[PDB]
Design a binder for this molecule. Sequence first.
Ligand SMILES: Cc1c(C(F)F)nc2ccc(C#Cc3nc(-c4ccccc4)cn3C)nn12
Ligand SMILES: [Mg+2]
Ligand SMILES: [Zn+2]
Length: 313
Amino acid sequence: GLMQFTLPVRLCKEIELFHFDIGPFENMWPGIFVYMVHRSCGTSCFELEKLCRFIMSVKKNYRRVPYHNWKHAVTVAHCMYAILQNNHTLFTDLERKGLLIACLCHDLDHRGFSNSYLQKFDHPLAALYSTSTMEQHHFSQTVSILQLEGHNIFSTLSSSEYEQVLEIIRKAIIATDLALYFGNRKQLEEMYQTGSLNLNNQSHRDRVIGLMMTACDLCSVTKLWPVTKLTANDIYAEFWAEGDEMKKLGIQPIPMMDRDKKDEVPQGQLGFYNAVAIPCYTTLTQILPPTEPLLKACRDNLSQWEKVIRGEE
Ligand SMILES: Cc1c(C(F)F)nc2ccc(C#Cc3nc(-c4ccccc4)cn3C)nn12
Ligand SMILES: [Mg+2]
Ligand SMILES: [Zn+2]
């Protein structure tokens, strides 16, 4: 009841910053997530015994792949924690509750393959869910774990509060489909610049939470350079495995997934920062000013990739 979680001093202070790295000690990641729920949401949001059992089941349903793993789940939740703590009064009790869970769950049972590869392999999930294939699967796994005995962390919510929270989580998880990001950010850009953006309009909140989700999901481009650079190795380890699998089906993968074109990674990261990351954090900073550190760190990393291209590293 009066059982606070506390972190060592360097973590207690650094966890509040956007560029925090959760570290290589897997056994501390659950405690870090509980710490973030307790300060983000309150010590009363969830029954501790249920939350702990929920976390350990979520962890067991992430696979040992190079990037889309348990460490990515907790990393994406910590970015969400930083956004919520820097924008205290902008979010409902239900949103605080839903979004950290959404982030922890957002890639449940990922296999390290894109929606495209599922469609070309003709995976059963591609027939069950024709768009946002993996993302509809992640939400489906979340509901499964929520319905295991002793795992219902939302048990104290009313029938209609429960339905709202599962709807926040569903939209949040669907929005991590980067194919959906491009149109969502363009609409948020237009709405902000014409002054129609209205946080009382629920379909507007939906879009802002969607963009927050893309920003949390891409938060590896916002870390200190050595974290960003080493994470890129995990990201490409999956892309190149998918590339290998495309070649097995008799299909030339795109160059991003072709390990034969390793040499042009620096130029590919440039494209990605300019086409995806920079716009994402730009529009997010416009709508939520205290998120500017994400944009600043993103720009610093683009500048490090430029340096790699010029042979300065
Ligand atoms: C860092 C990161 C994160 C997360 F850290 F945010 N998520 C993502 C998602 C995509 C990418 C890319 C990428 C990319 N490489 C190439 C390329 C590479 C070699 C030869 C030719 C082309 C093209 N392209 C778009 N980076 N990324
Ligand atoms: Mg995903
Ligand atoms: Zn993700």
